[PDB]
Design an enzyme around this catalytic site. Structure first.
Site, short mmCIF file in Angstrom:
data_model
loop_
_atom_site.label_atom_id
_atom_site.label_comp_id
_atom_site.label_asym_id
_atom_site.label_seq_id
_atom_site.Cartn_x
_atom_site.Cartn_y
_atom_site.Cartn_z
N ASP A 1 8.15 19.54 -29.67
CA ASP A 1 8.35 18.29 -28.93
C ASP A 1 9.44 18.48 -27.90
N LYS B 1 3.04 31.57 1.60
CA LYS B 1 2.37 31.13 0.37
C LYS B 1 0.87 30.93 0.59
N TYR C 1 8.10 17.07 -0.41
CA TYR C 1 8.11 18.32 -1.16
C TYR C 1 8.02 18.04 -2.66
N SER D 1 13.44 6.05 -13.45
CA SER D 1 12.41 6.72 -14.24
C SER D 1 12.22 8.16 -13.78
N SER D 2 12.21 8.39 -12.47
CA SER D 2 12.07 9.75 -11.95
C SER D 2 13.25 10.62 -12.37
N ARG E 1 1.95 1.46 16.01
CA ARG E 1 1.65 1.41 14.59
C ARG E 1 2.09 0.08 14.00
N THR F 1 5.74 28.37 3.82
CA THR F 1 4.43 27.77 3.59
C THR F 1 3.31 28.68 4.05
N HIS G 1 12.76 13.07 3.21
CA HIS G 1 12.18 14.38 3.49
C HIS G 1 11.98 15.22 2.22
N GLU H 1 11.21 14.08 -0.56
CA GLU H 1 10.23 13.39 -1.39
C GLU H 1 8.83 13.98 -1.22
N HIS I 1 16.03 15.54 11.24
CA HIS I 1 14.96 16.02 12.10
C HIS I 1 13.91 14.96 12.38
N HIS I 2 13.83 13.93 11.54
CA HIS I 2 12.86 12.86 11.73
C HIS I 2 13.33 11.80 12.72
N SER J 1 -2.08 26.95 -7.44
CA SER J 1 -1.89 28.36 -7.72
C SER J 1 -2.49 28.73 -9.07
N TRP K 1 7.31 0.00 4.74
CA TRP K 1 7.80 0.67 3.54
C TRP K 1 9.23 1.15 3.73
N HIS L 1 0.83 -1.20 0.00
CA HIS L 1 0.00 0.00 0.00
C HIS L 1 0.86 1.25 0.00
C1 HEA Z 1 -1.10 8.52 -2.01
C2 HEA Z 1 -0.93 8.41 -0.71
C3 HEA Z 1 -1.85 7.63 0.14
C4 HEA Z 1 -3.28 7.42 -0.02
C5 HEA Z 1 -4.23 7.92 -1.06
C6 HEA Z 1 -3.59 6.57 1.14
C7 HEA Z 1 -4.96 6.11 1.38
C8 HEA Z 1 -5.46 5.52 2.63
N1 HEA Z 1 -4.64 5.08 3.59
FE1 HEA Z 1 -2.55 5.09 3.66
N2 HEA Z 1 -0.46 5.24 3.73
C9 HEA Z 1 0.35 5.98 2.96
C10 HEA Z 1 -0.13 6.83 1.87
C11 HEA Z 1 -1.50 6.88 1.35
N3 HEA Z 1 -2.54 6.26 1.93
C12 HEA Z 1 1.78 5.88 3.26
C13 HEA Z 1 2.93 6.56 2.59
C14 HEA Z 1 1.83 4.95 4.39
C15 HEA Z 1 3.06 4.47 5.12
C16 HEA Z 1 3.07 3.05 5.65
C17 HEA Z 1 3.50 3.15 7.09
O1 HEA Z 1 3.21 4.17 7.74
O2 HEA Z 1 4.19 2.22 7.57
C18 HEA Z 1 0.40 4.65 4.58
C19 HEA Z 1 -0.04 3.74 5.62
C20 HEA Z 1 -1.41 3.60 6.08
C21 HEA Z 1 -1.76 2.91 7.33
C22 HEA Z 1 -0.82 2.27 8.30
C23 HEA Z 1 -1.27 0.84 8.50
C24 HEA Z 1 -0.45 0.20 9.57
O3 HEA Z 1 -0.32 0.83 10.64
O4 HEA Z 1 0.30 -0.74 9.24
C25 HEA Z 1 -3.22 3.00 7.38
C26 HEA Z 1 -4.03 2.44 8.48
O5 HEA Z 1 -4.18 3.03 9.53
C27 HEA Z 1 -3.69 3.73 6.17
C28 HEA Z 1 -5.06 4.06 5.80
C29 HEA Z 1 -5.48 4.64 4.53
C30 HEA Z 1 -6.90 4.76 4.22
C31 HEA Z 1 -8.07 4.37 5.04
C32 HEA Z 1 -6.91 5.37 2.91
C33 HEA Z 1 -8.14 5.69 2.17
O6 HEA Z 1 -8.18 7.10 1.91
C34 HEA Z 1 -8.29 4.91 0.88
C35 HEA Z 1 -9.43 5.56 0.11
C36 HEA Z 1 -8.78 6.39 -0.95
C37 HEA Z 1 -8.91 7.70 -0.99
C38 HEA Z 1 -10.05 8.37 -0.28
C39 HEA Z 1 -8.03 8.43 -1.98
C40 HEA Z 1 -8.36 8.06 -3.40
C41 HEA Z 1 -7.12 7.52 -4.04
C42 HEA Z 1 -6.93 7.64 -5.35
C43 HEA Z 1 -5.76 6.93 -5.95
C44 HEA Z 1 -7.97 8.27 -6.24
C45 HEA Z 1 -7.71 7.69 -7.61
C46 HEA Z 1 -7.72 8.74 -8.69
C47 HEA Z 1 -6.69 9.58 -8.84
C48 HEA Z 1 -5.39 9.30 -8.19
C49 HEA Z 1 -6.76 10.64 -9.90
N4 HEA Z 1 -2.55 4.11 5.35
C1 HEA Z 2 2.45 15.41 1.36
C2 HEA Z 2 3.48 15.02 2.07
C3 HEA Z 2 3.90 15.76 3.28
C4 HEA Z 2 3.90 17.20 3.48
C5 HEA Z 2 3.52 18.32 2.57
C6 HEA Z 2 4.40 17.30 4.86
C7 HEA Z 2 4.57 18.61 5.48
C8 HEA Z 2 5.08 18.89 6.81
N1 HEA Z 2 5.43 17.91 7.66
FE1 HEA Z 2 5.40 15.83 7.42
N2 HEA Z 2 5.48 13.77 7.03
C9 HEA Z 2 5.10 13.11 5.93
C10 HEA Z 2 4.52 13.76 4.76
C11 HEA Z 2 4.38 15.20 4.55
N3 HEA Z 2 4.68 16.13 5.47
C12 HEA Z 2 5.30 11.65 5.96
C13 HEA Z 2 4.97 10.64 4.90
C14 HEA Z 2 5.89 11.41 7.27
C15 HEA Z 2 6.30 10.07 7.84
C16 HEA Z 2 5.34 9.36 8.76
C17 HEA Z 2 5.94 8.01 9.02
O1 HEA Z 2 7.14 7.94 9.34
O2 HEA Z 2 5.18 7.02 9.07
C18 HEA Z 2 5.95 12.78 7.82
C19 HEA Z 2 6.49 13.01 9.15
C20 HEA Z 2 6.65 14.31 9.78
C21 HEA Z 2 7.24 14.47 11.11
C22 HEA Z 2 7.78 13.41 12.03
C23 HEA Z 2 6.62 12.50 12.35
C24 HEA Z 2 7.03 11.08 12.17
O3 HEA Z 2 6.90 10.58 11.03
O4 HEA Z 2 7.26 10.40 13.19
C25 HEA Z 2 7.19 15.93 11.34
C26 HEA Z 2 7.69 16.57 12.57
O5 HEA Z 2 8.81 17.03 12.65
C27 HEA Z 2 6.58 16.56 10.16
C28 HEA Z 2 6.33 17.98 9.96
C29 HEA Z 2 5.84 18.59 8.74
C30 HEA Z 2 5.76 20.05 8.65
C31 HEA Z 2 6.14 21.05 9.67
C32 HEA Z 2 5.24 20.28 7.33
C33 HEA Z 2 4.98 21.61 6.76
O6 HEA Z 2 5.88 21.85 5.66
C34 HEA Z 2 3.55 21.81 6.33
C35 HEA Z 2 3.56 23.02 5.41
C36 HEA Z 2 2.33 23.80 5.75
C37 HEA Z 2 2.29 24.64 6.78
C38 HEA Z 2 3.44 24.74 7.74
C39 HEA Z 2 1.14 25.62 6.80
C40 HEA Z 2 1.62 27.05 6.86
C41 HEA Z 2 1.55 27.51 8.29
C42 HEA Z 2 1.23 28.76 8.59
C43 HEA Z 2 -0.09 29.29 8.14
C44 HEA Z 2 2.20 29.66 9.33
C45 HEA Z 2 2.04 29.27 10.78
C46 HEA Z 2 3.36 28.94 11.44
C47 HEA Z 2 4.33 29.85 11.53
C48 HEA Z 2 4.19 31.00 12.46
C49 HEA Z 2 5.35 29.92 10.44
N4 HEA Z 2 6.23 15.56 9.17
CU LIG Z 3 11.01 15.81 7.51
#
Ligand code: HEA
Ligand code: HEA
Ligand SMILES: [Cu+2]
Ligand SMILES: CCCCCCCCCCCCCCCC(=O)OC[C@H](COP(=O)(O)OCCN)OC(=O)CCCCCCCCCCCCCCC
Ligand code: CUA
Lengths: 534, 55, 269, 59, 236, 45, 102, 47, 77
Positions: A92, A319, A245, A157-158, A438, A316, A241, A243, A290-291, A256, A127, A62
């Protein structure tokens, strides 16, 4: 069809293949996550009688398919190769064989994952591939090797896609476009290209050494020899990290674009926002560890990392204020891409601010590796990938293919999927704040009702996806009948409330994107003479 | 026929932002009043149970 | 007539490429290689000859693509200044990715400067773990490699200036030095420093050195390709798409080698 | 050389695929992939056909 | 302790470190809540007011006053929400005379607690396993899937060191009730100063995957008085 | 000539319904989990 | 933001001076209503004169509706009343008393 | 590549032909999509 | 501990104390392993290793001394 489709060398004919692969992968992954949620509705073996390794492999599949196999071909590849060369005006892209080899290197990854899940060994280490759990000491069989080759091919590919984007943007850009007037989406994809270029090699090398350790009877990071997996986990976080972004920045660009066009007003300081994305991309490398606050590193290092995170949070917010100013003081038409954009600016912002709160150095003691972090990233993944893809599809589909979609169906679909996503992902933070673990097929009997509500929300979401694929079918089969009647909107731009409709016949679709001024999709090698801007 | 115009450029967003900040602050205070009351009650119970057994 | 064709082929540096099967065949080769290796290292069949043949045919396909990427630049031509700059920037970013790979390999052991950790290492230099150190052993080859790079960089500059008998002398010297390098690499095939049993400190260095032994093979193969390419005499001192690549490669590899030699040799000893 | 211009003229006159350079090599390499890779990937799922079916159901 | 059902907040505090962590967390949550309320109301009022806007104000691009206002506000907001985090880290991370030290090793799907600070009969090192009771073989009245045959004890109103490690796979010493969450590296150790002031039974689980059989995994903590700890030590 | 407003009149009469509606929306969005808690046998009722 | 009304006003009358057809009239009217600058009665009279030159009464209906509801302006009425009556009875374009009771 | 009108060639579909009224292909798309989860569940355990 | 062992701690101003046990154990193992008569020079940090430091390090170092391959970098005495 083999003579032109299986042997294509055209970005126009390969973007649709990217889209088909993306939608197939997404629907398969949604069904498979449906299975995952359904077996977790209640404690016990309700549907998975034993074999928790199977649940682990299901989770790995998944996560991997959601991250690298669904969204990467869609907005990075599929949208990039059909928007960037089109907006440039070049006939092209440079050397489309790069695009073709990048596309064709995917499917065996899918087959290797399916055959690895088929065998009894399986890849049940999450994963993340942190050693030694993925080595021969715990998980044997070719499943690990197949997953490694799949991630390697996806990375190649990426990288090839980034190569094509960079060369197209820098070497053969049109004369009219310059550095000080370049649009937002292409800047987003170019910055994403920089980040991808600077992030792929570290994962490639580190996973190569892991494979070598598994094969050559050696260990660089495993304890069997004196190694430490903490170094590899630093490298893996250093890759991971950037990824998020990478997957969120083209979403920022398209959002936008849609808000700028739907507000009937120009952008709010395009220089400020492009500086914001550039700063985000450059600062994404300062939080490489940081993670990993869980080890207990020096307090100065943790303070530096939390300072870097709070610095990263600022662009962020700036923006977000930029979109808010963009939508402020402008005419509003409640069309479905605007609904997707609003859902984004609400729920993604809430998730990001929750993550900013979580970004504290000492706050990982209660939230890290719990349901709180999954509730965090599910928010942003749904907002910037699922809803962003839906908005882009409903925003360019009427012209990139000439086929319209039912507006009523689109509205009900957005409502269903929005409420489903909300009701699924909201309780996960309540699970996380308690301190639940988890990646466990079975859980204690404390939060059963939250799991049940998550399950019913998952069923709502999958019914929404079924409605969405039915919408795709209807658009592909009844576009001509929908265009003539009032089943759908044929002009996303209603005329200004000062002008007559008869003059509007010459003012049909006018915006800041060239492909909208184009007629029905012409031949692949269109754009005989490049566009010039005075 | 009022000559002074163009004064609507900025005060609308300013008043909107300040009213939103005030509403958020007062709403957060209203929610946190009960949370702080409960927290103080729990703290007082903790001190009572730690001090009553020793003496 | 001239204006219309110039406009229709000017901003189009891309040929009307036939239904080329290169992507599907290369993807098929990679999938076959991957599944074969997975099945052979741990599976049901321990066959080794046919997986070697699969690797061989994958390498032949790669070599075929690599020779086409320079044959079509001259035989087919149809290139402008913009596409030449695109190719040059592509090569720069490949060598930049290689630099990043080298940086990761260096950081695999270079972050232990002042021993920030506690146990399982955290001792620079690692006193007590004194096996046959791969340090200062191949420096006799590194110094002569630096000398060869210095003496061939300007030879290749004169090459790209004139492409004459001096260029022939430069390329024969390059062949001689790469032959010496591959020979002295192969002489340390099995017993170079030591084998990986316990105490992995120089084994990481050995693997890092070994994994970069394919870049020199690629450079030698490209040099042979350009040698035959000039033997056909079709590629004159014009669209030298291979000469620019080899001069930039030899101008970056010496720099990265000097960067390697700055540390890890006299640092900590 | 003495063959570049003539070969280019012939290629321009006869716009045909395979690039005329290695037809024998292409005809040698085309059946090899089908003979080898298909026959080596068929066992990968043929052999575990009897192995497949491990329900491991417990109650 | 036991995760309270239908909870929407933290679990009951057990240590001053946890009450300080909760204080910091709610202090951060206050500002985060006001910010999210501000942005949500902004979005709602925009979509409610300008949806009927006939003419768009498309010649506004500068907005210097708001620009400087929301360029300077986030800096002070971040400073005022980060200062309590730093002060709490300084307060909690202080090594204020840890009095008790025991081993906590993450083995393969089981744990082997070893008590070497204290003795049982004469100089010997106390050590015992912690195996999860199977669900089928559960005794009446127990907690499903987590309860163990034997758990570890801890004195009250003292200071405790939890030496966390692993044997083959990385584990986690995550105890939300006691405010201790340290990764279990296979070869590297770490020291966390846990001080307990309140009695009770604190639960907990390893917040890191251990392969497959990670669903039946016990970490149970029982807080006892000094006479109770001495009596248990003599009995063990 | 300051015709009518006197900002306060229209200001209040326009925002008060809107702020009440938004407060009701938030109350519903926070009470639906409360509705679930009430409906479920949280207290064996 | 400290921008003089006279320059853009004079630009407006100069643009309406060469109103060959309705296109430039419409674009300049849209530009004038784009700003927060409430149009003066003079520019409104010039716009109505140009509309009379191009002979499109519905454009006059549209501009009158826009003046009736363009910005809140603290809900000012008598200013709107005079700014409408002067241009209604300057030459005579009867349009408002019909669409409202329909 | 210039022999295509630009209407339906962008998709590997075909309205003409009674073999599939876009229903056999759509059902097949469901089948190939739902293959991996159900077969993954079935190979080691029950649905 | 009877709720009073040292009181205030000021040995290391910075919060993190990962590199603390080495210095506090080398001196103890030294003063143990030359004289063994009077422990007055190392009579002030009895608890810095018994309870203030992970006893797993102490037991591993003792086992290493028994096997002759010490984790730290000290002499043969
Ligand atoms: C694309 C990113 C994405 C999406 C869509 C989802 C969709 C969902 N995810 Fe998942 N998930 C992850 C990214 C995503 N996840 C990642 C990165 C992990 C890490 C594994 C880990 O933490 O160890 C994770 C792990 C994860 C866990 C951890 C399980 C465990 O602890 O072992 C769980 C359960 O709690 C969960 C629940 C769900 C549910 C209920 C949905 C539901 O929302 C499903 C229903 C779908 C949607 C509502 C979105 C529609 C999706 C589309 C594809 C639409 C198709 C059309 C277009 C794309 C144009 N996800
Ligand atoms: C779409 C993908 C995506 C995006 C965009 C982000 C965006 C952000 N993420 Fe996250 N993150 C994940 C995907 C993502 N993350 C995944 C997959 C994990 C791993 C989980 C796992 O390990 O299972 C993770 C884990 C993760 C952790 C550790 C948790 C952990 O995994 O155990 C933390 C904490 O340090 C964090 C923080 C943030 C912050 C601060 C932003 C910010 O950049 C968000 C940007 C937006 C805002 C910040 C809004 C703007 C705020 C304001 C309006 C200003 C207010 C504040 C000020 C005064 C400046 N992320
Ligand atoms: Cu990070
Ligand atoms: C449909 C709208 C989208 C879902 C909203 C509800 C999701 C939460 C939920 O479905 O809650 C489900 C909880 C049950 O919880 P339970 O543990 O008692 O279920 C265990 C026993 N089955 O209450 C309800 O059944 C509420 C049912 C509706 C009550 C109002 C109408 C009464 C007549
Ligand atoms: Cu664990």
């Amino acid at each position: 069809m083999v003579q032109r489709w299986l042997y294509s060398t055209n970005a126009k004919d390969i973007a649709v293949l990217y889209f088909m692969l993306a939608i197939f992968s997404g629907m398969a992954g949604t069904a498979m996550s449906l299975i995952i949620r359904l077996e977790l509705a209640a404690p016990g073996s309700q549907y998975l009688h034993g074999n928790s390794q199977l649940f682990n492999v299901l989770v790995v599949g998944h996560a991997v398919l959601m991250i690298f196999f669904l969204v990467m071909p869609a907005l990075i590849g599929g949208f990039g190769n059909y928007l960037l060369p089109l907006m440039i005006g070049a006939t092209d892209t440079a050397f489309p064989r790069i695009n073709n080899i990048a596309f064709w290197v995917l499917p065996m990854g899918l087959v290797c994952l399916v055959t690895s899940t088929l065998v009894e060994s399986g890849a049940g280490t999450g994963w993340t591939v942190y050693p030694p759990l993925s080595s021969i000491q715990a998980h044997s069989g070719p499943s690990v090797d197949l997953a490694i080759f799949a991630l390697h091919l996806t990375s190649i590919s990426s990288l090839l896609g980034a190569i094509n984007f960079i060369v197209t943007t820098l070497n053969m850009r049109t004369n009219g476009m310059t550095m000080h007037k370049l649009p937002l989406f292409v800047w987003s994809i170019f910055i994403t290209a920089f980040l991808l270029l600077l992030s792929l090699p570290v994962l490639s090398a580190g996973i190569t050494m892991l494979l070598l350790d598994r094969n050559f009877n050696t260990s660089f990071f495993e304890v069997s020899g004196g190694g430490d997996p903490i170094l590899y986990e630093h490298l893996f976080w250093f890759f991971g990290h950037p990824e998020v972004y990478i997957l969120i920045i083209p979403g920022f660009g398209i959002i936008s674009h849609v808000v700028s066009t739907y507000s009937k007003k120009p952008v709010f300081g395009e220089i400020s926002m492009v500086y914001a994305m550039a700063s985000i991309g450059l600062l994404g490398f300062l939080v490489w560890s940081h993670h990993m606050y869980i080890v207990g590193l020096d307090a100065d290092t943790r303070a530096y990392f939390t300072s870097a995170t709070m610095i990263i949070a600022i662009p962020t917010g700036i923006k977000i204020f930029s979109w808010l100013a963009t939508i402020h003081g402008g005419s509003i038409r409640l069309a479905t891409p605007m609904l997707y954009a609003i859902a984004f600016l609400f729920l993604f912002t809430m998730g990001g601010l929750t993550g900013v709160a979580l970004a504290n150095a000492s706050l990982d003691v209660a939230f890290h590796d719990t349901y709180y972090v999954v509730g965090h990233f599910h928010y942003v993944l749904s907002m910037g990938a699922i809803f962003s893809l839906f908005a882009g599809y409903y925003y360019w589909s009427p012209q990139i293919l000439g086929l319209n979609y039912n507006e009523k169906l689109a509205q009900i679909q957005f409502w269903l999927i929005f409420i489903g996503a909300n009701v699924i992902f909201f309780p996960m933070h309540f699970l996380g704040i308690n301190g639940m673990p988890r990646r466990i097929p079975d859980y204690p009997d404390a939060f059963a009702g939250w799991n049940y509500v998550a399950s019913i929300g998952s069923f709502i979401a999958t019914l929404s996806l079924f409605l969405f694929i039915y919408i795709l079918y209807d658009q592909l089969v009844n576009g001509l009948n929908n265009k003539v009647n009032n089943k759908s909107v044929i002009y996303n731009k209603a005329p200004d409330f000062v002008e007559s409709n008869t003059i509007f016949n010459l003012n049909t679709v006018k915006s800041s994107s060239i492909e909208f001024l184009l007629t029905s999709p012409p031949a692949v090698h269109s754009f005989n003479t490049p566009a010039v801007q005075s | 026929t009022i000559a002074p115009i163009t004064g609507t450029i900025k005060r609308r967003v300013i008043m909107d932002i300040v009213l939103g900040f005030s509403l958020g602050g007062v709403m957060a205070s209203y929610w946190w009043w009960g949370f702080h009351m409960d927290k103080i009650n729990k703290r007082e119970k903790f001190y009572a149970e730690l001090a009553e057994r020793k003496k | 007539m001239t204006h219309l064709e110039r406009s229709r082929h000017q901003q189009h540096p891309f040929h009307m490429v036939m239904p080329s099967p290169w992507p599907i065949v290369v993807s098929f080769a990679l999938l076959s290689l991957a599944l074969s290796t997975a099945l052979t290292m741990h599976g049901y069949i321990g066959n080794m000859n046919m997986v070697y043949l699969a690797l061989f045919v994958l390498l032949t396909s790669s070599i075929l693509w690599f020779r086409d990427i320079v044959a079509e630049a001259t035989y087919l031509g149809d290139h402008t200044m913009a596409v030449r700059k695109g190719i040059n920037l592509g090569f720069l970013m490949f060598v930049l990715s290689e630099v990043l790979i080298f940086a990761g390999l260096f950081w695999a052991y270079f972050h232990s400067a002042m021993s920030p950790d506690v146990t399982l290492g955290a001792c620079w230099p690692p006193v007590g773990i004194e096996a046959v150190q791969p340090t200062e052993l191949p420096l006799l080859n590194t110094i002569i490699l630096l000398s060869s790079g210095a003496t061939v960089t300007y030879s290749h500059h004169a090459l790209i200036a004139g492409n004459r008998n001096k260029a022939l002398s430069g390329l024969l010297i390059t062949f001689w030095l790469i032959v010496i390098f591959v020979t002295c690499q192969y002489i340390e095939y099995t017993n170079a420093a030591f084998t990986i049993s316990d105490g992995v400190y120089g084994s990481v260095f050995y693997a890092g050195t070994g994994l970069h032994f394919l870049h020199m093979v690629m450079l030698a193969a490209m040099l042979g390709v350009n040698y035959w390419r000039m033997r056909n005499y079709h590629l004159t001192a014009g669209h030298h798409v291979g000469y620019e690549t080899t001069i930039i490669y030899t101008h970056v590899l010496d720099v990265i080698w000097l960067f390697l030699y700055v540390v890890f040799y006299w640092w900590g000893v | 050389a003495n063959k570049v211009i003539q070969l280019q003229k012939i290629f321009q006159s006869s716009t045909k695929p395979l690039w005329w350079r290695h037809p024998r090599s292409a005809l040698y390499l085309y059946p090899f992939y089908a003979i080898f890779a298909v026959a080596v990937v068929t066992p990968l799922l043929y052999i575990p056909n009897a192995i497949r079916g491990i329900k491991a159901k417990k109650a | 302790d036991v995760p309270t059902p239908y909870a929407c907040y933290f679990q009951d505090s057990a240590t001053p470190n946890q009450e300080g962590i909760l204080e910091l967390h709610d202090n951060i949550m206050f500002y985060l809540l006001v910010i999210l309320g501000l942005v949500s109301w902004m979005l709602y009022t925009i979509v409610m007011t300008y949806s009927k806007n006939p003419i768009a104000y498309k010649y506004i691009k500068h907005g210097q006053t708001i620009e400087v206002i929301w360029t300077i506000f986030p800096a002070v907001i971040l400073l005022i929400i980060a200062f309590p985090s730093f002060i709490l880290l300084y307060l909690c991370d202080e090594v204020i005379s840890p009095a008790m030290t025991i081993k906590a090793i993450g083995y393969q799907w089981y744990w082997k607690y070893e008590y070497s600070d204290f003795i049982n009969d004469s100089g010997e090192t106390v050590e015992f396993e912690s195996y999860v009771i199977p669900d089928e073989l559960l005794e009446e009245g127990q907690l499903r899937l987590l309860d163990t045959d034997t758990s570890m004890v801890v004195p009250v109103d003292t200071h405790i060191r939890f030496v966390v490690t692993a044997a083959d796979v990385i584990h986690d010493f995550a105890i939300p009730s006691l405010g201790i969450k340290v990764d279990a590296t296979p070869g590297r150790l770490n020291q966390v100063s846990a001080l307990i002031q309140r009695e009770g039974v604190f639960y907990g689980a390893c917040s890191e995957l251990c392969g497959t059989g990670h669903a039946n995994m016990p970490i149970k903590i029982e807080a006892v008085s000094l006479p109770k700890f001495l009596e248990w030590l003599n009995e063990q | 000539g300051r015709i009518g407003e006197s900002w306060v009149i229209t200001e209040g009469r326009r925002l008060i319904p809107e702020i009440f509606q938004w407060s009701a929306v938030l109350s519903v969005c926070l009470g639906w989990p409360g509705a679930v808690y009430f409906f479920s046998k949280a207290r064996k009722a | 933001d400290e921008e003089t009304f006279e320059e853009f006003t004079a630009r407006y009358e100069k643009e309406f001076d060469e109103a060959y057809d309705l296109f430039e009239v419409q674009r300049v009217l849209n530009n004038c209503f784009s700003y927060d600058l409430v149009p003066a009665p003079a520019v409104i009279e010039k716009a109505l004169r140009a509309a009379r030159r191009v002979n499109d009464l519905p454009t006059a209906i549209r501009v009158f509706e826009a003046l009736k509801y363009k910005v809140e302006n603290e809900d000012q009425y008598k200013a709107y009343l005079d700014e409408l009556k002067d241009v209604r009875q300057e030459l005579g374009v009867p349009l408002k008393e019909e669409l409202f009771p329909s | 590549v210039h022999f295509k009108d630009g209407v339906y060639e962008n998709i590997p579909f075909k309205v003409k032909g009674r073999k599939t009224p876009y229903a056999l292909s759509h059902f097949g798309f469901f089948a190939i999509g739902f293959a991996v989860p159900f077969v993954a569940c079935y190979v080691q355990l029950k649905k | 501990s009877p709720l009073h062992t040292v009181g205030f701690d000021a040995r290391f101003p910075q919060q993190n104390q990962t590199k603390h046990c080495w210095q506090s154990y080398v001196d103890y193992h030294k003063c143990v392993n030359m004289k063994g008569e009077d422990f007055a020079p190392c009579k002030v940090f009895w608890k810095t290793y018994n309870a203030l430091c992970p006893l797993d390090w102490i037991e591993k170092w003792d086992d290493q001394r028994e096997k002759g391959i010490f984790a730290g970098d000290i002499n043969s005495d």
